[PDB]
Every structure is written in structure tokens, then in C-alpha cells.
Design a protein around this ligand. Structure first.
Ligand SMILES: [Cl-]
Length: 407
């Protein structure tokens, strides 16, 4: 009694997503971004497509490049992707990894010299996430050892054992800072959904390749924290910022993070095999997906950016909430069987193809205005890597493969 799209449609979508990933996204990253002056990858590519090999380079961007090529190599086998992942890995261990105090720096100069040596938990998480994926792709022992060491540092210097969760930023020598903001957009509060979501994401990937008992408990504690403090059942949205005891300190809504969390929380519980926790997580996950469906979308099916603290709807289409909606809506279809979620996934994909991707200049536009005009934003920068859109394509391809197997 499944309602399932016909084989033609599933295959057509899968083919389009694969083409987008391999002929647009990964092609751009493999050809435009490698830097033969300093090694590794450039920190910025402007709106005109020009790479800037002298720009400062962020740990998050570089971890994202490692993760994406590693995951693409694992799933698709293409030797170029392993080559590109190795390139990212080598630069990362050489320059981002602090061999003295452990963990990864926030930002280095193009030549590898540390510029911003803070140890932000968000960056530590992305390091764990990428290193564990590289291990999953290659069996590399050093990558897994490094991921384990960073996990140990987060738990040692950042874990709040009284209230749950984590202090989010420390200095180079792991002493806590007051200002844990990832960027100027962010509220100056001690706890954020965003950082905790990516600790969860990282820990789930680590557990998959290293199923340590204590890690399972830390991951479960994070899932339980989301269910108890972060997810808001009255509205179907995540609360974004908090004090140390998880009292809400924000009323803003992020549609992209809602739909991202919707599928990542289920990935995390499934990695654990925690059958007792799953029903509650699925309920919250489906709610986040429905809330996004009903409140976060334009008539074209694309996702708006946020409702701000004063209530203003930011109608810009940023690239990453569209990617996250592709996976989150397909996931919601898989979980619920409700084909309206598949239709929503199809609609966001059509938007991605018709509006978000940049056919002229390659990759995807960072932002498109409500009237359809692309903003002249950078194509690659500190916060724009190949991870959200690359992962979204990889996830969709695999999910559509499973759906095709129901026949
Ligand atoms: Cl990204």
C-alpha cells in the first residue's frame, strides 16, 4: 500500500542529481579550487569565478572539502575524488592540526601559518566528521586516530556535565572563551543549536567507524538534549540560542537547520541502533519536516532563509537550505511513506536546477533574491564549501537507489 513514484520518475531524478553532482559541483571544485602555490585549496573564489590563493583559509571549509571528496570517492569510486581528498587531507594535517595542544585552528594564512588559533567546537566537529569519513573511504589509521584525539579534547575541555552539551569555543590552549559566535550574525549566547547539531553529526560519523561505548553514551546524551531542550514541540522548530541551562535566548527560526536536523537526528539514532529512542526522534523529525513544508517554503517550493528575532521573514534563497531540503524531504518520504514529501523534494530540486545552480559560472549561487536575481556573492568562502550541496546529492542518489529497489 505504498504510494511510490514510478520507476521513470525516480530514475530521472537520480540521473539529474548524479549529473549535477559530477558534472557541475565536483567538477567546479576539482578544477577551480586546487592551489598549486601553497598546496591544498583556495580560501575564496569571487563572484566572477576568480580563485584567491592568497586569501586566509578556514578549517571548516577545508574539512568540508575533505569530507565531500572522501564521501564521493567512497560512493562513486572515481579516482580523481580520492586524489582531491588526499590533497585536502595532507594540507589539513600539516597546517590546521595543532600538534602541540591538539585539535584544529580556526583559520590559517594561505601558506599555512596560524592566523586565528581559537579552538571552536564547531570546527573540531567538522574535523572529526571529515577525518572519520576519510577513514571510512580508505581505512587510513592516522585519520581515525586524529579524529579520536579531537573527540577526547572536546570531552575533556568543553563538556558541560551538569547541564548537558558543550562550551563552544576555547583559545588555542583550550581555555574557554566568552564569545562563541561563529560569525557576526550569531547571538552572543553561550549555547547554540548550530554547534550542537554538528557535534551530533560528527559523533555519529565517528561512532560508525569506531563504536566506542562511552561515545555511544555521549551521542545518546546529545540526541536526548535535542529532544528535551532544542526541539520545540509547540512550533515544530528548533530554538537557536540558549544560556548554559538551556533556557531559550532566541525566537528566530531557521528553516534550513530545521530540515537538516530532521534527517541528521534520525541518522544519529540509527547509527546507535537505539530502537527505544527512535519513535520519539522520528516524531520530532517528521514534525520538523512538516513545519518546514508548511511555513518555510515559497510557492515555487524553495526554502526561505529565516524568521529573524524581530519576526522579519528573510525571503532570500540561500544555497544550503535548498540542499538540506532535498535530503530532508526525501528522508521524510522514506520515514512516513507520505508522497507529498517526495513531491516537495522534486519541487526543491526543480528550483535548484532552474534558479540556484549557476550554469554560466559553475557550482551554485550562494543566494538568490525573491524576484529571481542572483546576488553577486563569493562562490567559495569561509562558509561556502562543497559539503551541503555535495552531501545532498550523494544522499539523494543513495536514497533514490533504495526506493528503486522497492520494485
Ligand atoms: Cl558547504
Amino acid at each position: 500500500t505504498e504510494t511510490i513514484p514510478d520507476v521513470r520518475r525516480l530514475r530521472a531524478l537520480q540521473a539529474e542529481v548524479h549529473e549535477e553532482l559530477t558534472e557541475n559541483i565536483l567538477k567546479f571544485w576539482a578544477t577551480r579550487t586546487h592551489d598549486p602555490v601553497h598546496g591544498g585549496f583556495v580560501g575564496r573564489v569571487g563572484p566572477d569565478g576568480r580563485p584567491h590563493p592568497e586569501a586566509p583559509r578556514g578549517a571548516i571549509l577545508n574539512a568540508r572539502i575533505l569530507w565531500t571528496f572522501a564521501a564521493a570517492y567512497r560512493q562513486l569510486g572515481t579516482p580523481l575524488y580520492r586524489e582531491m581528498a588526499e590533497r585536502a587531507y595532507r594540507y589539513f594535517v600539516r597546517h590546521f592540526v595543532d600538534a602541540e595542544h591538539g585539535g584544529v585552528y580556526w583559520m590559517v594564512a594561505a601558506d599555512g601559518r596560524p592566523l586565528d588559533t581559537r579552538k571552536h567546537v564547531y570546527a573540531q566537529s567538522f574535523a572529526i566528521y571529515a577525518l572519520s569519513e576519510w577513514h571510512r573511504a580508505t581505512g587510513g589509521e592516522a585519520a581515525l586516530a586524529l579524529a579520536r584525539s579531537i573527540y577526547d579534547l572536546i570531552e575533556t575541555h568543553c563538556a558541560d556535565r551538569v547541564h548537558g552539551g558543550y562550551v563552544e569555543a576555547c583559545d588555542r590552549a583550550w581555555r574557554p572563551l566568552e564569545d562563541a559566535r561563529l560569525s557576526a550574525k550569531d547571538a552572543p549566547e553561550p549555547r547554540s543549536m548550530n554547534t550542537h547539531l554538528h557535534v551530533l553529526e560528527a559523533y555519529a560519523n565517528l561512532y560508525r567507524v569506531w563504536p566506542e561505548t562511552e561515545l555511544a553514551a555521549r551521542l545518546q546524551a546529545l540526541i536526548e538534549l535535542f529532544l528535551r531542550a532544542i526541539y520545540h514541540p509547540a512550533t515544530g522548530h528548533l530554538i537557536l540560542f540558549f544560556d548554559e541551562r538551556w533556557r531559550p535566548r532566541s525566537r528566530a527560526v531557521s528553516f534550513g537547520h530545521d530540515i537538516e536536523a530532521s534527517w541528521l537526528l534520525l541518522e544519529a539514532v540509527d547509527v546507535l541502533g537505539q530502537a527505544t529512542l527512535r519513535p520519539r526522534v522520528q516524531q520530532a523529525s517528521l514534525h520538523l519536516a512538516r513545519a518546514t513544508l508548511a511555513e518555510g517554503r515559497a510557492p515555487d517550493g524553495s526554502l526561505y532563509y529565516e524568521i529573524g528575532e524581530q519576526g522579519h521573514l528573510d525571503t532570500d534563497r540561500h544555497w544550503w537550505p535548498q540542499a538540506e531540503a532535498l535530503v530532508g524531504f526525501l528522508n521524510a518520504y522514506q520515514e512516513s511513506g507520505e508522497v507529498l514529501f517526495y513531491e516537495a523534494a522534486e519541487d526543491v530540486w526543480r528550483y535548484i536546477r532552474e534558479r540556484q545552480r549557476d550554469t554560466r559560472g559553475g557550482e551554485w549561487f550562494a543566494r538568490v533574491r525573491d524576484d529571481g536575481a542572483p546576488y553577486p556573492d563569493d562562490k567559495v568562502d569561509f562558509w561556502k564549501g562543497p559539503y551541503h550541496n555535495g552531501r545532498a546529492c550523494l544522499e539523494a542518489i543513495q536514497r533514490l537507489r533504495h526506493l528503486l529497489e522497492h520494485v
